[PDB]
Amino acid sequence: KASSIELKFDRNKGEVGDILIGTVRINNIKNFAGFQVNIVYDPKVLMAVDPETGKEFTSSTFPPGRTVLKNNAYGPIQIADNDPEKGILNFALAYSYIAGYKETGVAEESGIIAKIGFKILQKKSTAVKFQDTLSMPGAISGTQLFDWDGEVITGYEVIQPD
Known part of the structure; x- marks a missing residue:
């Protein structure tokens, strides 16, 4: 019942060339209608890729895999502004028609908001994490x-990968 956003990996070690999949999930977020997150990684060691195809993310790549914020009746708008060369992913998605959404009275409070492949480029210990950025004032750990x-929304835990 604890409110949280989490970045979780299925596995955190692999051989160079394999793809680690990170899942961004929300849990018990009251009346959830949108988000923005900033995730950083070392672009020398991991490369952000589509989990299925292995195709490198570019600045406009919005990650696949969500199970929430998909109802077209409420006007979902995706924005990506990644800088993969600098090891930054930054993307946002929200329902525009929040009046129609609230009016139905059913909130999507838990689910997957992104799945992101990280292709291993070097055998080297490394960390992927939500991180604050000056372009997001008022954020909770990015x-x-x-x-x-x-x-x-405030009061939720930001859960980083182990």
């Missing part, structure tokens, strides 16, 4: 969650 009143 995360912002929004509700169906269009307000910023």
Whole structure:
């Protein structure tokens, strides 16, 4: 029942050339209607790729795999502004029609918001994490969650990968 955003890996070690899959998940986020996150990694050691195809993320790549914020009746808008050469992923998605969403009264409070492949480029210990950035003032460790009143949500835990 604890409210959280988590970045979790299926496995955290592999051989060079294999792809580690990171899943970004939300849990018990009250009246959840959108988010923005900033995730950083060492681009010399890991490369952000599509989990299925292995195709390198570019600046506009919005990650696949979500199980929430998919109802077209509420106007989902995806924005990506990654800088993979600098090891930065930054992407956001929210329902525009939050009036129609709130009016139905059923909130999507838990689920997957992204799946991201990380292809291993070197045999070297490394970390992937949510991290604050000056382009996101008022964030909680590089995360912002929004509700169906269009307000910023607080009080949740940011769970980093082990």
